[PDB]
Design a protein around this ligand. Structure first.
Ligand code: BCL
Ligand code: BCL
Ligand SMILES: CC[C@H]1c2cc3[nH]c4c(c3C)C(=O)[C@H](C(=O)OC)c4c3nc(cc4[nH]c(cc(n2)[C@@H]1C)c(C(C)=O)c4C)[C@@H](C)[C@@H]3CCC(=O)OC/C=C(\C)CCC[C@H](C)CCC[C@H](C)CCCC(C)C
Ligand SMILES: CC[C@H]1c2cc3[nH]c4c(c3C)C(=O)[C@H](C(=O)OC)c4c3nc(cc4[nH]c(cc(n2)[C@@H]1C)c(C(C)=O)c4C)[C@@H](C)[C@@H]3CCC(=O)OC/C=C(\C)CCC[C@H](C)CCC[C@H](C)CCCC(C)C
Ligand SMILES: COC1=C(OC)C(=O)C(C/C=C(\C)CC/C=C(\C)CC/C=C(\C)CC/C=C(\C)CC/C=C(\C)CC/C=C(\C)CC/C=C(\C)CC/C=C(\C)CC/C=C(\C)CCC=C(C)C)=C(C)C1=O
Ligand SMILES: CCCCCC/C=C\CCCCCCCCCC(=O)O[C@H](COC(=O)CCCCCCCCCCCCCCC)COP(=O)(O)OC[C@@H](O)CO
Ligand SMILES: CCCCCC/C=C\CCCCCCCCCC(=O)O[C@H](COC(=O)CCCCCCCCCCCCCCC)COP(=O)(O)OC[C@@H](O)CO
Ligand SMILES: CCCCCC/C=C\CCCCCCCCCC(=O)O[C@H](COC(=O)CCCCCCCCCCCCCCC)COP(=O)(O)OC[C@@H](O)CO
Ligand SMILES: CC(C)=CCC/C(C)=C/C=C/C(C)=C/C=C/C(C)=C/C=C/C=C(C)/C=C/C=C(\C)CC/C=C(\C)CCC=C(C)C
Ligand SMILES: CC(C)=CCC/C(C)=C/C=C/C(C)=C/C=C/C(C)=C/C=C\C=C(C)\C=C\C=C(/C)CC/C=C(\C)CCC=C(C)C
Ligand SMILES: CCCCCCCCCCCCO[C@@H]1O[C@H](CO)[C@@H](O[C@H]2O[C@H](CO)[C@@H](O)[C@H](O)[C@H]2O)[C@H](O)[C@H]1O
Ligand SMILES: CCCCCCCCCCCCO[C@@H]1O[C@H](CO)[C@@H](O[C@H]2O[C@H](CO)[C@@H](O)[C@H](O)[C@H]2O)[C@H](O)[C@H]1O
Ligand SMILES: [Fe+3]
Lengths: 306, 43, 250, 54, 281, 54, 54, 54, 42, 44, 43, 54, 42, 53
């Protein structure tokens, strides 16, 4: 039929690109991995090379120890039985200390201590990775948009695991490390605080997640629609506007009365995406500390019938 | 062999300094462990 | 802090939501002004500035330094659309279509439009040409899918217009950009990969009929394509979808 | 034994020192946290019970 | 109005219906057969929502709710005060959405670009029709659809979810949530990477796609590419909406119980069904 | 040893100083937080109990 | 057995040592934690019960 | 029979050795964990019962 | 072959690999004998 | 070479001297603080 | 077999030092296991 | 019967050997697990009942 | 015609493969005899 | 005869791979179905015959 430019028709392979040098320590950059045809049908086939520095080593060891702690707790919870491990893999959980321990570090290993150890490992891993995202952009002379967009997700992560439990006075307020157990935690969080639907910042977070899906479906469809004019080369369209950028702007201007630029659409994108967790962290931080019943709060604020 | 480009003398000097650091760390750790065992033996 | 209000029902949650409303108003203002760096100020259908410029002022100009000694771009700035446009207005009133006064594909108007981009090749990060013929590209080869080289090319009139002789690959992204097609007269044209359908025994180009392949704009250098030439070629081929309609399914 | 120094022949000193510091710090924190988890070695609780504190 | 480059693009043609009868622009907007249809449907829907607010007795925008017919009406018509206004507004909304998609198709044809945007909008329209048309018709009553209120459709979401216990345990719901989360993450990363390439450290030259590829290869060891990221975004969004529509179309039609009990099939597999230990032993 | 000063000939001073600043700040905050979370070492609560302020 | 040395002509010493160190540390931590979870081999609880501590 | 030495002509020694090491370690770990989960072969519990350690 | 190894290279590599395999198997045999004497599984 | 960072032996030795002065200052203040806390409320 | 640009004598040297480290580690582990077994036999 | 070697002229040795090794391992694991599941052939429980180890 | 192996190379490879298959089958037959003497399944 | 013309339409590699997959799946299916019926479950028949359970 008509080629919609979703999967490549022809794959071409050349020498692997080793990347730009700039101010990057090339000794900390590994070699190029293999080429993936399966990945090349959709995007780039080349795997690697990766950069491994001091913060990279710290982040990998910390995250590996986090995964190892959770996994060995799961193996203990299975009785060291591999069949039980596979049967109950989604039912295992590393739970925070019980509420009677407050914020103290005196909880036993099977009753909260191991969760604290794993949480320290995760803390170090995630903050090391944030520093890594900053420094990798600094080495190439790029702006630090990735680092400050990652900080928006780190904000919600900190509120869920660190800030709100401290403000609430117990580690039991934090999220367990498990597949079904963190879903149970989410449901019980909504149930305990009234209805999280009636949290205005939960609503804002949902609006911005829906808008992220909206905007990035729109952007992907727009770029694929003008890719016949080389619209996927967005940096060159910013530097030297072509007919792809003009047609993309005019479609949306004729459709909804206003458009963007080849640059400013990505400002819309970054802000719509970061506002999800930006509003989510505020919504979680206000639960239990300021509002204990969100439905009654919405009733008192004109959102629900009295 | 050699990958980082260090001569024999350079490697020997670096190893000497690293070994000094390791011995100071281990001496402090041994003193701390002896103090804890006197305070509360774990055997 | 539960239930503590400064006045009325105003607690920290109300303060936070009103603060976010103020912040969102400011952010949306900033975002809309950031997107007025191209195409503004607005103008009438005769090119003169429009009385209505909208509610957002133009942002203060910003400057890009171009990567390879290619100069400096300031936006928003003076506009560059000075090439003649072969369109005549079909109505005295504003807001009605302008009809072509000749062949729209040759004049580059409508869906066949092109922009006066720089008459220089796009460079990768190392200062070399970004798009190169596969045979000129060192070490490049087809790794998956059907190789289109050697296949005949069929237009939308179900007629053969040439044969594929080369693939123009994008060296940094390692993707095929253009197919080089040799015509009857022995000359060659570039066709974007996004506008062709590679089949088992042929390459089908639904946009152009077999007689419109010779009208595709030609590139100056046989081993080099510029942004201007790319833009002209892509505009011609895509305008074929609308201006070659009377020659379909034959 | 008396030939070890040649680690520094094949291993970059900076990488080795960074990895060693990361490992030592993580291990020390883990051991201290395990000790705080055990009621018989939580020194804060031990001193609280010894001096009749809260 | 016109953008500085707009004039050469405003040409006749590209209309599915109407020819030159509606081939013009109102301000920046393009009007067509489907533009006129969209305006009529949207205006009727909004005015009928205002009239429903008059009937309901509130003018608070956050308290206005248009409710579907009761379960007693089945799939038949309902009095306008009870659920008839909801049915008319749903018809108006469907007409407005489909006419919006077809107007986008006309604009795509006029501009000579692909039809990816109307196709991606059809997915959202299909999810909406799943929630208001396909699932209620399968279930046998218009009252299983959601009301048209800012906070009462959240009440519908909560009630429908808790009919089946914790709705987190719907597996297609899990897949759709994974797709939504991955899409938001990818949108953040893509916006950040393009902005960081175009806006380097002050005084520096613009960065190239080579720098973007280098930066994510340094970070995660893989870069999907400029075309790959936009394809990935389209597919992530469309997959999220597809799996949402699927999880709602299977709910209450082939699954009627608590979704948490569904996962007992994996636990009760014959070989590890009866091994003691763990959580389920 | 009397020759530790060459650690500065291997590692960049800026990176070392930043790493120490971050590590010391986080270690101090962590220890102060543990002490506050311990009821027997929360100095505000100790003073409240001692001076009969609640 | 007197010819294993040429394994170093196949495998990079740096890769081998890094992977071996990570594997050995993880195995040792796993064994120590398994012993801790075993009531008869948790030396901390054994000493707590022996000395009448907790 | 004694011509197996050609197996290295076809297969890369690096991949073969890495895969064999991973497979052998995983198989050994699985067998050990199966024995540990078996109450009749849990050597720690067997010793605990034998020496009355609980 | 594919690896490009010479014939004598394959001889030596297989000799060393087999020596390692025999050492591993001898240790495994001793371990299995000790376990079987301690607590037989048949 | 004599190093990776690009510091002369004398530059490195001077920087180490200043670093150790700062470290000894910090450690003296910490020792006094620990002594005061132990006298106020011992943890052993 | 020249897979890593490493000479035969360099391989011999590196293996000698690696095995020296391996035997030190193994001797320490044997002593530790002996002490644990005397303290609490697991058979 | 005396011409099966020509299979190697049609099938690459690497892929054939990898596929056969994987198939053999999976078949052996399946048969061993099937025997383990049946109480009359589970050698661990058979020995446990024979020697009264529980 | 795809691998490019000659007649002699293919014959040698198949001979080694057959030697391996017979060794594996002999070990499996001995193990099966041991199991049958332990607990026959017929 | 003349069945050898089948090696004029299909690739022999694909033919052999598909036929091997087919035969293995069929054999596994038949063995599992035999194990499903207690009449031809040789492990269970052996258990009943020798009073092993
Ligand atoms: C998706 C499955 C659920 C659903 C569950 C949720 C949950 C859970 C939440 C919402 C929330 C919203 N939903 Mg809802 N929502 C559903 C279906 C809808 C429909 C529809 C036609 O299908 C629409 C119009 C909306 C609209 C809304 C907005 C009130 C709000 C923000 C969403 C958003 O910004 O997305 C992204 C789109 C954009 C960013 C573009 C702008 C969207 C504008 C703001 C739409 C406004 C609609 C307007 C109030 C009414 C339209 C007609 C009027 C007469 C003009 N919902 C169904 C039944 N929805 C959130 C909220 O805060 O409500 C209080 C919230 O927490
Ligand atoms: C009964 C269930 C509850 C409910 C209770 C919760 C709770 C509780 C929360 C939400 C929150 C959210 N809810 Mg809700 N939610 C409900 C119903 C809904 C409905 C609906 C249609 O019904 C919608 C669409 C949503 C949607 C959402 C999102 C808008 C928001 C999650 C943002 C996010 O992306 O976090 C995902 C991103 C993160 C968690 C941050 C991740 C960043 C870190 C650093 C990741 C590190 C990775 C780690 C190192 C692992 C590495 C692995 C390797 C790399 C492989 N809710 C109801 C009423 N919901 C959250 C929120 O913030 O809103 C206030 C939240 O806390
Ligand atoms: C704006 C808000 C959204 C967002 C944004 C966002 N996330 C981000 C970023 C941004 C902008 C990054 O820059 C950062 C990133 O790196 O992206 C690729 C990231 C990131 N977001 C991630 C996850 C994530 N984001 C989520 C959500 C969101 N992220 C929001 C929707 C979620 C959800 C919904 O739950 C998740 C799970 C990561 C992929 C990444 C941060 C990764 C990180 O910190 O990793 C630390 C590592 C660990 C803790 C685990 C390591 C586990 C390994 C097993 C370690 C051992 C490896 C081993 C040594 C390998 C050995 C190999 C050899 C043997 C061969
Ligand atoms: C399928 C992938 C995602 C997606 C894609 C998508 N959406 C799209 C498009 C695409 C590709 C467009 O091209 C189109 C567009 O032009 O966007 C600017 C659009 C669009 N998606 C929109 C909204 C939207 N998309 C959503 C979701 C999604 N859109 C998916 C997650 C949501 C959610 C989740 O709530 C919303 C609210 C619009 C901004 C726009 C379509 C505008 C339109 O239809 O215009 C004509 C109709 C009107 C002007 C309004 C008619 C009003 C009715 C007559 C009465 C009210 C009825 C309504 C049901 C009441 C609701 C009450 C309560 C529930 C609040
Ligand atoms: C890189 O390229 C790209 C661009 O730039 C070249 C772009 O701009 C865009 C577009 C994206 C943006 C501008 C970002 C902002 C967009 C959003 C945040 C999405 C949400 C949008 C809204 C909430 C706006 C809603 C507006 C609507 C629905 C239009 C209103 C419509 C009417 C009032 C009726 C229209 C019908 C008419 C006029 C028919 C006329 C008939 C009569 C008058 C009779 C994208 C995706 C892109 O990828
Ligand atoms: C049939 C459909 C309905 C009828 C048509 C409706 C059309 C348009 C009406 C839109 C109504 C918007 C109302 C905004 C209210 C802002 C004020 C506010 O911030 O309200 C707060 C709560 O609202 C809140 O969460 C508001 C936040 C909602 C959650 C986030 C949604 C964001 C959506 C856009 C995001 C961009 C509380 O403040 P109060 O001091 O108690 O206010 C009192 C009044 O509400 C009357 O009692
Ligand atoms: C992160 C962001 C998250 C949520 C925010 C979503 C809402 C964004 C609204 C953008 C509105 C600004 C568009 C605009 O102001 O466009 C103007 C017309 O817009 C028009 O008709 C249509 C105006 C938009 C109506 C939106 C109604 C809601 C035209 O401007 P110029 O004459 O070119 O100057
Ligand atoms: C690191 C933690 C790994 C622990 C596994 C312990 C057993 C490893 C046995 C290795 C035996 C040979 C010694 C060796 O080889 O040492 C290392 C083995 O690494 C490797 O196990 C890499 C293995 C990758 C997966 C590691 C985890 C395996 C178990 C989980 C699998 C799921 C180094 O290998 P390389 O030269 O980098 O390989 C290069 C590849 O291109 C070869 O194809
Ligand atoms: C280049 C030159 C000259 C020299 C290079 C130097 C070199 C090469 C040095 C390397 C020397 C060394 C250490 C070599 C080591 C080799 C080793 C340990 C080999 C070991 C082999 C072991 C093998 C097969 C074991 C196979 C076992 C199998 C299937 C078991 C299958 C079990 C099943 C199916 C489980 C059944 C039971 C249950 C499910 C409960
Ligand atoms: C086979 C082998 C060997 C291994 C298998 C390994 C396996 C199976 C692993 C399974 C891993 C799984 C399921 C993980 C699931 C995780 C999930 C859902 C997590 C969800 C949310 C988590 C959050 C918000 C955590 C936030 C934590 C934060 C902010 C910070 C905490 C910091 C603290 C508390 C420090 C405390 C300590 C000190 C101060 C010293
Ligand atoms: C970045 C900026 C940071 C600073 C931000 C400061 C924002 C300040 C915004 C103040 C707006 C106050 O807005 C006003 O608050 C009062 C507080 O009771 C609300 O509450 C009022 O109405 C409701 C509804 O009838 C009554 O139940 C309530 O008793 C009455 O007080 C009003 O409905 C609201 O209109
Ligand atoms: C940013 C981290 C540093 C600042 C942290 C601020 C809060 C720190 C803790 C504040 C008080 C915690 O409250 C403490 O919790 C313990 C937990 O056993 C309780 O103990 C009972 C007491 O209620 C109290 O002593
Ligand atoms: Fe983009």
């Amino acid at each position: 039929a008509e080629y919609q430019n979703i999967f490549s028709q022809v794959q071409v392979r050349g020498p692997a690109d080793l990347g730009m040098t700039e101010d990057v320590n090339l000794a900390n950059r590994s070699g190029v991995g293999p080429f993936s045809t399966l990945l090349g049908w959709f995007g780039n086939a080349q795997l690697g090379p990766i950069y491994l520095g001091s913060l990279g080593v710290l982040s990998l060891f910390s995250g590996l120890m986090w995964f190892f702690t959770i996994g060995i707790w799961f193996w203990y919870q299975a009785g060291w039985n591999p069949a039980v491990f596979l049967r109950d893999l989604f039912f295992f959980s590393l739970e925070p200390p019980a509420p009677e321990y407050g914020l103290s570090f005196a909880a036993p290993l099977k009753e909260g201590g191991l969760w604290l150890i794993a949480s320290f490992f995760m803390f170090v891993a995630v903050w090391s990775w944030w520093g890594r995202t900053y420094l990798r952009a600094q080495a190439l002379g790029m702006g630090k948009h990735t680092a400050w967009a990652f900080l928006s997700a780190i904000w919600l992560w900190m509120v869920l695991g660190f800030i709100r439990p401290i403000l609430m006075g117990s580690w039991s307020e934090a999220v367990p490390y498990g597949i079904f157990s963190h879903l149970d935690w989410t449901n019980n969080f909504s149930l305990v605080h009234g209805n999280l639907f009636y949290n205005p910042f939960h609503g804002l977070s949902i609006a911005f997640l829906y808008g992220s899906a909206l905007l990035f479906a729109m952007h992907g469809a727009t770029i694929l629609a003008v890719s016949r004019f080389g619209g996927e080369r967005e940096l060159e369209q910013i530097a030297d506007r072509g007919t792809a950028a003009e047609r993309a702007a005019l479609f949306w201007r004729w459709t909804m009365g206003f458009n963007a630029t080849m640059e400013g659409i990505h400002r819309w994108a970054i802000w719509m995406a970061v506002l999800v967790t930006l509003t989510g962290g505020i919504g979680i931080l206000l639960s239990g500390t300021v509002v204990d019943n969100w439905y009654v709060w919405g009733q008192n604020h004109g959102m629900a019938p009295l | 062999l050699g990958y980082t480009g260090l001569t024999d003398e350079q490697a020997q000097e670096l190893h000497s300094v690293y070994m000094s650091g390791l011995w100071l760390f281990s001496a402090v750790a041994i003193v701390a462990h002896l103090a804890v065992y006197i305070w509360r033996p774990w055997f | 802090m539960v239930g503590v209000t400064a006045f009325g029902n105003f607690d920290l949650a109300s303060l936070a939501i009103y603060s976010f409303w103020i912040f969102l108003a400011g952010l949306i203002y900033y975002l809309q002004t950031e997107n007025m760096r191209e195409g503004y100020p607005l103008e009438n259908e005769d090119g003169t500035p429009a009385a209505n410029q909208g509610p957002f002022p133009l942002p203060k100009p910003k400057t890009f330094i171009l990567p390879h000694g290619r100069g400096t771009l300031t936006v928003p700035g003076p506009e560059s659309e000075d090439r003649p446009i072969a369109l005549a207005r079909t109505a005295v009133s504003e807001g009605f279509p302008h009809a072509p006064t000749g062949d729209p594909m040759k004049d580059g108007v409508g869906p066949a439009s092109w922009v006066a981009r720089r008459d220089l090749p796009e460079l990768d990060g190392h200062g070399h040409n970004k798009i190169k013929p596969m045979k000129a590209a060192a070490g490049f080869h087809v790794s998956a899918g059907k190789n289109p080289i050697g296949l005949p090319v069929r237009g939308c009139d179900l007629e053969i217009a040439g044969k594929v002789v080369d693939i123009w690959v994008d060296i940094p992204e390692q993707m095929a950009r253009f197919l080089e097609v040799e015509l009857k007269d022995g000359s060659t044209r570039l066709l974007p990969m996004q506008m062709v359908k590679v089949q088992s025994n042929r390459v089908h180009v639904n946009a152009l009929s077999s007689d419109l392949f010779a009208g595709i704009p030609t590139i100056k250098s046989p081993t080099e394509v510029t942004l201007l030439e790319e833009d002209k070629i892509c505009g011609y081929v895509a305008g074929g979808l609308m201006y070659a309609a009377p020659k379909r399914k034959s | 034994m008396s030939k070890f120094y040649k680690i520094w022949m094949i291993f970059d000193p900076r990488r080795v020192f960074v990895a060693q510091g990361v490992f030592l710090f993580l291990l020390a924190v883990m051991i201290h946290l395990i000790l705080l988890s055990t009621p018989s070695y939580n020194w804060l609780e031990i001193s609280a019970a010894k001096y009749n504190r809260v | 109005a016109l953008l500085s480059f707009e004039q050469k693009y405003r040409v006749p043609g590209g209309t599915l219906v109407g020819g030159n009868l509606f081939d013009f622009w109102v301000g920046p907007f393009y009007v067509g057969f489907f533009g006129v249809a969209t305006f009529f449907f949207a205006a009727l829907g909004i005015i009928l929502i205002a009239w429903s607010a008059v009937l309901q007795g509130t003018w608070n925008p956050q308290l206005i709710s248009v409710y579907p017919p009761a379960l007693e009406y089945g799939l038949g018509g309902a009095p306008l005060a009870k659920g008839g206004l909801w049915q008319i507004i749903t018809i108006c909304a469907t007409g407005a959405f489909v006419s919006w998609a077809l107007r986008e198709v006309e604009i795509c044809r006029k501009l000579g670009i692909g039809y990816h945007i109307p196709f991606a909008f059809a997915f959202a329209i299909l999810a909406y029709l799943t929630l208001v048309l396909f699932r209620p018709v399968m279930m046998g009553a218009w009252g299983y659809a959601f009301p048209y209120g800012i906070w009462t459709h959240l009440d519908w979401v909560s009630n429908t979810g808790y009919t089946y216990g914790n709705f987190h345990y719907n597996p297609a719901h899990m897949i759709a949530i994974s797709f939504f989360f991955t899409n938001a993450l990818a949108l953040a990363l893509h916006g950040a990477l393009v902005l960081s390439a175009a806006n380097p450290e002050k005084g520096k030259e613009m960065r190239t796609p080579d720098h973007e590829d280098t930066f994510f290869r340094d970070l995660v060891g893989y870069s999907i590419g400029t075309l790959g990221i936009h394809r990935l975004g389209l597919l992530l969004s469309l997959s999220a909406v597809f799996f949402s529509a699927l999880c709602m179309i299977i709910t209450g039609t082939i699954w009627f119980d608590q979704w948490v009990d569904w996962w007992q099939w994996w636990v009760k597999l014959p070989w590890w069904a009866n091994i003691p230990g763990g959580i389920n032993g």
